[PDB]
Design a protein around this ligand. Structure first.
Ligand code: HEC
Ligand SMILES: O=C(O)c1cc(C(=O)O)c2c(n1)C(=O)C(=O)c1cc(C(=O)O)[nH]c1-2
Ligand SMILES: O=C(O)[C@@H]1CCCO1
Ligand SMILES: [Ca+2]
Length: 670
């Protein structure tokens, strides 16, 4: 009614000029990152360091999901849009806390296995009356802002090979809606595509890595890039990787957009490109002309990527003084553990400093190239990878407060040990090849020896000019949520252990907190409605680490929590180690290999891990393990994302899996 008409009117106003005008005072949060630079800085200061202790719950909304929720809500004139699990979009009237509409693309649940890292979505984009979502199955869908009905869709995977999915938020720059995809763990060729925002007509496409060099190159950037790959490994079969699954930003004055590119496929550099090569444009920040998609320049953060070191993590465009001169930069802290400051007018390196311990490089030289540590490229034997695949910083948003000059950065360590699988062949699944049973192709072996580093999680306030930490708050677990900062001198961040917390932006002192029940991964947003400031966070534990581990005992549905000074709304709202399953201990080794090939990256290690948004097999009732075939072949949980292993497991393979599951629980029992 009133909500639908308000929604139509509010979203109709969203365009480039609107996003710029929203800068002087930010009453709305029109893009997932507030502005095109994606600073995630609100200029609102009604909630400030002196009164944030009086925040209370204004309302909460049930997203009804059970898997990860990674999106920051966007809000214009009190009308909120946020996605949940399986690409479902919700439009919420913040004045009542009630649903306006829900759009469910009805993703085939049997395809949950096609993505490496949970069935997530990092948000929607708004533009001239429509809401855009990148769906799991490859559709870019434009929805009517008032009704949630589809206006148009594009099958963005048409004609492209491999296990592609979409998890990121689209961006709309100058009337073109742009989206990438995920899949480099499986073997795909990364690309982004731009479509007309009004009609959906395809406008341009840019691939981040070259195709078969015996075929015409799509553009000069591809011909140039081919000179940095060794064709003896036929990289184009597996695809090469380079997926752009998360960060994109835009500078309208420079008429330049920027995209972070992903890791190599397969992960092992010696397998992917045998004789060497930087493998452009993997692991880079790339600048493109937003109108034509044409390459302008790039800066490669990790040449010869060999550890799943994506550069897709969220960058922030900022204007800061360095060496006493004004510089227009890009701030970026990707998985590899270095905080980069780059010149956004030309891609020139300014500085890089590690923000956590690292063991693949000792630093960057004066030309902006890493100085490698040899052992890290020795794939012939197990080697701890620090930061490793989970990343020193993953997609969880960071934020920049220009008044303190600090970047509030979620940092962590999840120990992993890697070595190369020199006998890997693309799509040839087999025992011991990690998750190959559902299409992964990393060409690595994991934890052939136990990693030695210790896990950690902390919120860093990083000074990009001095390239050092101004303050740090230690958390109990890795995989804490994204951040928000505001002119009220506060920083908001949810924790893996189940709280939304506000800290003083200058000191890191904790000023306020509330429980969220489940661990939080998405970053909050803030906005004004009828003269009052609200802070909202969409809570749904998940993402790749959240599939298998957790730091709260409690599990519940995805929920948007919204706080205001004085709110009074009421808040909404482990196990036994498996024992007794009959098994043959002699089959534990065979079961270990079959389990690593088919189950580990969703169910974790039985008993050792406790379960995240997917339950751990070492804590299930014995009936599930005693009767395992009932569950792995066209099981009752297919509708929830448990794959069908028909044609993948046979004979006595399930008995071997039982032996590994009960045997591992028996080995660690106190
Ligand atoms: C992620 C893509 C998965 C892979 C790979 C495997 N499993 Fe799974 N499983 C997954 C989900 C999302 C679920 C449902 C969780 C819920 O209850 O909501 C499951 C569930 C199971 C179960 C319980 C079955 C049931 O009907 O309740 C079992 C026993 C199980 N899965 C076993 C299992 C094994 C042995 C796998 C490797 C062969 C395996 N799963 C892979 C997701 C994923
Ligand atoms: O290589 C890829 O294409 C790809 C895709 C995605 C994804 O789309 O979410 C992730 C990753 N890689 C990845 O390396 C990673 O650490 C990761 C974590 C998460 C998550 O949502 O928690 N997604 C992804
Ligand atoms: O790269 C991935 O898809 C994830 C990150 C952690 C392990 O595998
Ligand atoms: Ca990856």
């Amino acid at each position: 009614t009133g909500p639908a008409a308000q929604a139509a009117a509010a979203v109709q106003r969203v365009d480039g000029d609107f996003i710029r005008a929203n800068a002087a005072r930010t009453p709305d949060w029109p893009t997932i990152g507030v502005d095109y630079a994606e600073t995630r800085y609100s200029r609102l200061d009604q909630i400030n360091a002196a009164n944030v202790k009086d925040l209370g719950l204004a309302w909460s909304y049930n997203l009804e999901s059970t898997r990860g929720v990674e999106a920051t809500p966007v809000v214009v004139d009190g009308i909120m849009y946020v996605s949940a699990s399986w690409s479902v979009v919700h439009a919420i009237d913040t004045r009542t806390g009630n649903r306006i509409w829900t759009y469910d693309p009805q993703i085939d649940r049997s395809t949950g296995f096609k993505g490496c890292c949970d069935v997530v979505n990092r948000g929607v984009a708004l533009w001239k009356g429509k809401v855009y979502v990148g769906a799991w199955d490859g559709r870019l869908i434009a929805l009517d802002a008032a009704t949630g009905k589809e206006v148009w869709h594009q099958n963005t995977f048409e004609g492209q090979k491999g296990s592609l999915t979409i998890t990121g938020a689209p961006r709309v720059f100058k009337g073109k809606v742009i989206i990438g995809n995920g899949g480099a763990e499986y073997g795909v060729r990364g690309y982004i595509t731009a479509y007309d925002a009004e009609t959906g007509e395809r406008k341009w496409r840019w691939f981040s890595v070259p195709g078969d060099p015996s075929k015409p190159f799509e553009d000069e950037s591809m011909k140039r890039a081919a000179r940095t790959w060794d064709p003896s490994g036929k990289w184009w079969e597996a695809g090469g990787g380079g997926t752009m699954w998360d960060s994109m930003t835009f500078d309208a004055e420079l008429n330049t957009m920027y995209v972070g590119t992903g890791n190599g496929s397969p992960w092992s550099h010696k397998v992917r490109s045998p004789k060497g090569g930087d493998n452009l444009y993997l692991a880079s920040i790339v600048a493109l002309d937003p109108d034509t998609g044409k390459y302008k320049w790039h800066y490669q953060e990790t040449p010869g990527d060999n550890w799943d070191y994506t550069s897709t993590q969220p960058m922030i465009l900022a204007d800061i003084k360095i060496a006493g001169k004004p510089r227009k930069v890009i701030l970026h802290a990707p998985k590899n553990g270095f905080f980069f400051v780059l010149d956004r007018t030309n891609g020139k390196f300014i500085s890089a400093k590690n923000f956590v311990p690292v063991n693949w490089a000792s630093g960057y030289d004066k030309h902006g190239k890493p100085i490698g540590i040899a052992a890290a490229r020795d794939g012939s034997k197990p080697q701890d990878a620090v930061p490793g695949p989970y990343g020193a910083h993953n997609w969880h948003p960071m934020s920049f407060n220009p008044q303190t000059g600090l970047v509030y950065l979620p940092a962590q360590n999840v120990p992993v040990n890697l070595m190369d699988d020199k006998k890997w062949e693309f799509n040839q699944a087999g025992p011991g090849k990690p998750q190959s049973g559902t299409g992964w192709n990393t060409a690595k072996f994991f934890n052939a020896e136990p990693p030695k580093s210790k896990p950690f999680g902390r919120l860093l306030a990083w000074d990009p000019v001095a390239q050092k930490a101004a303050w740090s708050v230690e958390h109990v677990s890795p995989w804490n949520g994204g951040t928000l900062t505001t002119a009220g001198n506060v920083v908001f961040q949810g924790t893996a252990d189940g709280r939304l917390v506000a800290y003083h932006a200058a000191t890191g002192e904790k000023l306020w907190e509330a429980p969220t029940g489940t661990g939080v991964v998405a970053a909050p947003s803030t906005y004004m409605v009828d003269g009052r400031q609200y802070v909202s966070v969409a809570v749904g534990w998940g993402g790749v680490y959240g599939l298998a581990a957790r730091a709260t005992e409690r599990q519940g549905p995805g929920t948007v929590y919204t706080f205001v000074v004085g709110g009074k709304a009421r808040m909404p709202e482990t196990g036994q180690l498996l024992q007794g399953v009959k098994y043959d201990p002699a089959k534990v080794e065979a079961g270990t290999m079959l389990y690593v090939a088919n189950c580990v990256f969703c169910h974790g290690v039985p008993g050792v891990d406790r379960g995240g948004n997917i339950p751990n097999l070492g804590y299930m009732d014995a009936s599930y393990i005693e009767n395992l075939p009932n569950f792995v072949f066209k099981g009752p949980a297919m509708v929830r994302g448990m794959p069908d292993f028909t044609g993948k497991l046979s004979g006595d393979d399930v008995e071997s899996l039982k032996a590994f599951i009960q045997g591992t629980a028996d080995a660690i029992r106190p």
